[PDB]
């Protein structure tokens, strides 16, 4: 029954974040276990083959700064990159990437499978072991149980799930797997609100049966680009294009008459195609985009048009579309329901306030997407291997990691939207961009030890060039009578008056640093302009820089006061009784949470801050 | 519902005998459909990651002189190649290779994935359409229902299996997959006797916790074989090695102290451990092999300890062995029972004797092993395909192909073992040899249009060179005073004592080929020396071939001389209670065979002969 070898934390659910989370836990020289149901699927994408993107890119570029693998099982699986925005401001460029499924999959695999410190094992689970608010062990379905000191759940879509297709349903964790059914009910009986949410794709097409001789082509950019820190362009497999198709009014006039068989007739937007029809009728016209998943397969995604109607709407819109003729269908398009729990009851950590060393990650958080579940099992995993060797945790803030955003955002929202990341979703974009993610996490993965040498030296290296490169230019200075001044004055507007200097000279928007590098002074550039972009965006948005770090370093105080959940706050006087409900609900952690919250005013705040200083639960709020 | 394209040839699974059969239906110009639970698991193994053996080579190249895949997805998926054998006569050598998983099961998605004719489909199956003993149509879970001319069940071990570890079970496929169970209850319906067997499988250990400097090396050989007629040793992967241990006094102590715990206190002979210890008590040694499941994982397959003992007991077996001290294992050994139904109800072409249309193959006939499945799934697919064109089907004989001999057995076996082919279980071994398949395999394989032009043009070459090679060395006479005898005289016995010819002069037996090529006459030998040892077989079993060939003729009007399964044996004068049960029970297809029975008599077949000459059933037995 009992495993004979104690361990520091298990992981429940190799998927996209319980990989994260045991290679955090392993390699910070803690001994991890890996239960999953079944091995080869470690690394299956189930959803659009597609990494990366307008707010994706971001989560994937700070697990890689941190010592993730995400960022590295792409370099060798994409077949196409792109970089979206790349004609606006650096902040706000994104990198996309269609990826082959097979070589992703190996790559995780291999990468996960040589983790010293790390062991793997295929079982389910069954039951979880809890006495006195503590977590310790669980139960497979064979018999045998283990021990450990804190655990992981990564379960994703698989906790209770039915698929949908018109209106007949059937049980499953996705398209080919099993649900976890008794483990819904063991974790319903822990104080958690538990809800479903739903969710569809589309089907698959086969790539020999459509007429791609009359189909618009799109590629990407000539420079293919990198995700990791280390890699280059070299570790890249063969590049495919895409395909670009459109609807017609028999697809909408189908849509229409067949609408009765739906289990509908529900997100802002319109994820289905039916919806995209009904909620904009004047339209006539809709983008579907055809692309490979993989260069060795020949089985087509089209993007753009998931539904939930039944298999013949189906086949009419595929065989009702240009080049779609005569084309057939491999795998139906299809939905899930899934439960979740509400993320109001775990602190900032993706640790439950109500159990100690239990902690959540992956879907069941509320989310959707593969970006989205690989930072939440990185922190946890991180969490729990401090945790277990009886050391601080850690969370960042929302003005160094969208991660904390996130974490902020799934704390405090109250909504029922499955949660997409977005760019503008975040208060402090000028600052939290995509090349310098490791400048402001790497340091802290070294204090914690998620960082090795080699990441270490190549920051190192970067950090010196990145000063050398400052001080090289804030040691420049030129003057309108100089000998080589004419020139400068040529190519450049408003001409030198007074004397110049070359960290004054770029302050002009028109001008650019590889121009400025090409100059009589101004000696030619480092041959690493990856680094040398970092200087251009500083002297760029140094004033906003600064104005947002006076505005951070201010509410320092409210971050830092926190709030214990076992707080009561109908014992405070002067409070509304609204708003003894709302926070009495929401359980904050902090002033600043609290303050975060919608509902609540500045009033309530100081009354709160004077009930604490009553009761002396702070030490001082400066 | 109905789906609006009817189609030829439906395959119901798409495991080791679906792809064959599909691949078969399709390239004979037939539309054929494959419906399969999940895709991404094509080509997948389940248990040793091994192809070929004694018997099992046999069957792969038999599959790919008339057309198959296995052959060819094995050739970029191998990471060790043996021979078994090799200083033995050339009608008993096999090729064995250790394969990696991934890229045999990557080679197999892709090839089958761009197969004009064929098309793919994700769904299970809940019930068949049967009418007036004719099947037509089947029935998938979403609601779905195709029409097809021809269904073919490749299931395997999926119909109603549950998995059994120690004294505890639960229902599933095998490790990580769902079972089938409606279909099982449905194919209860049909006119066919069922079963039910079990089979298990043994751990994986890590290769990164077993100390392998102090465990012994094994290597294939220098000069690399080759399965397929076609492909060459360049697209082989890079090798790996394989390690052997052994086990001590301490396992088997744990073994017979710990026994109590199992279901059971069976084959003939033992597939487990236990069973190993208990059959012989005396023997303290055993031999075990560690072997790699792929040149990039670390998952180590051992080899010969396979048990259904409970996990305490595994895990002490596998600590206590030298150099796995401090091992670990990522997946625990299990065994699973499945149903089969009895292969006494269906004709040689593997169509059941009372439904029309309806087709077996694979595990459901009472068979295990990749090679066992592979032949059957293509002899059916190619039987389902001739009957959807309206014309007469095929099936070979015990002297023409192994799967002769194992469609007669299982026909007409009785035993319950699973059926495992070995070389000595067929009376035709000395031409029914390896290199030799093609030539007798690959003419049939082109008039039934299963052979594309590349080996058609390499078949013409090769009988080219064959018949060339023996009419040269037919055209050579030597005599004893020959100018250039002495040297001939010097290096073989008996020296020349009247006129010699090559034709004669290897008769010797201690003469080779290569030996006599290198000699004043008898020019250098011909560059394609795979060509060239089918004449130094030919020469050296000429006496024993020409036996046999008039031995098989003689039985061939038993051969056709064929027995209908309304025969009712009761309405027969002069034969026995006891043989007119026996004959009933198996109702043979033809007297040859139902004399292949065991408790049938020559005065039996007489009688049978005499009754059919009587009633007129018979045109003439001459
Ligand atoms: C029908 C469908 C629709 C989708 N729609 C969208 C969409 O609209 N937008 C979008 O962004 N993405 C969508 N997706 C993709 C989806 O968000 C991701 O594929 C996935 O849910 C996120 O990964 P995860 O790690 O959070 O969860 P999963 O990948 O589901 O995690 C499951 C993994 O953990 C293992 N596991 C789970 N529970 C256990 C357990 N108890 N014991 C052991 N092992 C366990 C499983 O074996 C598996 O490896 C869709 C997917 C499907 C199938
Ligand atoms: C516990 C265990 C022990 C084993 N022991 C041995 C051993 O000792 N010796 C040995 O040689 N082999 C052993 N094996 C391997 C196995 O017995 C066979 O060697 C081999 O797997 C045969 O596979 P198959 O293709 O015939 O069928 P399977 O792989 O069992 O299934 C065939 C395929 O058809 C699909 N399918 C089935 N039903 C349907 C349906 N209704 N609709 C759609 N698709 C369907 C399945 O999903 C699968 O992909 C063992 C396997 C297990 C799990």
Not at 114 to 140: C, H, K, S, Y
Not at 197 to 214: E, H, N, Q, W, Y
Not at 508 to 513: A, N
């Amino acid at each position: 029954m009992f495993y004979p070898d104690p361990f520091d934390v298990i992981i429940i659910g190799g998927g996209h974040a319980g990989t994260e989370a045991a290679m955090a836990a392993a390699r910070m020289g803690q001994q991890t276990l890996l239960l999953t149901h079944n091995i080869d699927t470690l690394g299956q994408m189930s959803c659009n083959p597609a990494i990366g993107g307008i707010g994706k890119g971001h989560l994937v570029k700070e697990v890689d700064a941190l010592g993730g693998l995400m960022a590295k099982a792409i370099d060798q699986a994409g077949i196409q990159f792109r970089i979206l925005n790349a004609s606006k401001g650096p902040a706000v460029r994104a990198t996309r990437a269609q990826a082959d499924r097979v070589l992703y999959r190996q790559a995780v695999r291999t990468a996960l499978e040589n983790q010293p410190n790390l062991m793997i094992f295929q079982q389910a689970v069954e039951d979880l072991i809890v006495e006195n608010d503590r977590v310790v062990g669980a139960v497979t379905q064979m018999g045998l149980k283990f021990r450990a000191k804190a655990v992981v759940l990564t379960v994703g879509t698989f906790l209770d799930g039915k698929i949908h297709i018109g209106l007949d349903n059937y049980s499953g964790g996705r398209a080919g797997d099993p649900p976890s059914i008794p483990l819904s009910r063991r974790l319903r009986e822990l104080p958690l609100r538990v809800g479903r949410l739903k969710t569809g794709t589309p089907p698959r097409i086969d790539a020999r049966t459509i007429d791609f001789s009359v189909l618009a082509q799109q590629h990407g950019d000539n420079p293919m680009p990198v995700f990791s820190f280390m890699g280059n362009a070299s570790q890249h497999p063969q590049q495919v294009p895409c395909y670009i198709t459109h609807t017609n009014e028999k697809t909408h006039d189908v849509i229409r008459s067949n609408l009765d068989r739906s289990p509908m007739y529900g997100p802002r937007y319109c994820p289905s195609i039916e919806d995209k029809v009904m909620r904009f009728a004047d339209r006539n016209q809709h983008q579907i985009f055809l692309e490979p998943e993989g260069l060795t397969s020949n089985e087509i995604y089209p993007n753009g048009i998931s539904t939930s109607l039944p298999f013949d709407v189906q086949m009419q819109i595929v065989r009702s579309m240009q080049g779609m003729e005569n084309a057939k269908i491999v795998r139906p398009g299809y939905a899930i329901e899934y439960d979740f729990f509400d993320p109001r009851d775990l602190k900032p950590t993706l640790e439950s306030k109500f159990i100690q060393g239990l902690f959540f990650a992956g879907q069941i958080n509320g989310t959707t997407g593969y970006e989205e579940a690989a930072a939440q099992g990185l922190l946890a995993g991180l969490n729990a291997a401090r945790l277990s060797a009886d050391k601080e945790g850690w969370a960042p803030a929302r003005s160094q990691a969208y991660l904390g955003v996130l974490v902020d955002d799934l704390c405090t929202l109250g909504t029922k939207e499955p949660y997409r990341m977005f760019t503008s979703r975040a208060e402090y974009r000028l600052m939290l961009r995509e090349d310098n993610a490791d400048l402001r996490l790497t340091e802290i993965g070294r204090e914690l030890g998620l960082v090795d040498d080699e990441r270490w030296a190549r920051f190192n290296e970067k950090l010196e060039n990145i000063e050398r490169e400052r001080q090289r230019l804030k040691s420049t200075w030129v003057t309108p009578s100089a000998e080589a001044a004419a020139e400068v004055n040529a190519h450049l507007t408003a001409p030198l008056s007074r004397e110049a200097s070359g960290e004054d000279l770029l302050r002009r928007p028109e001008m650019t640093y590889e121009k400025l590098t090409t100059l009589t002074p101004f000696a030619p550039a480092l041959t690493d302009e990856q680094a040398a972009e970092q200087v251009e965006i500083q002297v760029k948005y140094e004033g906003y820089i600064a104005r947002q770090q006076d505005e951070i370093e201010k509410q320092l105080r409210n971050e830092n006061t926190l709030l214990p959940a076992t707080l009561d706050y109908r014992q405070v006087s002067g409070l509304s009784n609204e708003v003894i409900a709302k926070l009495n609900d929401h359980k904050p952690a902090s002033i600043g949470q609290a303050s975060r919250i919608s509902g609540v005013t500045p009033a309530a705040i100081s009354i709160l801050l004077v009930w604490l200083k009553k009761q002396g639960m702070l030490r001082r709020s400066a």
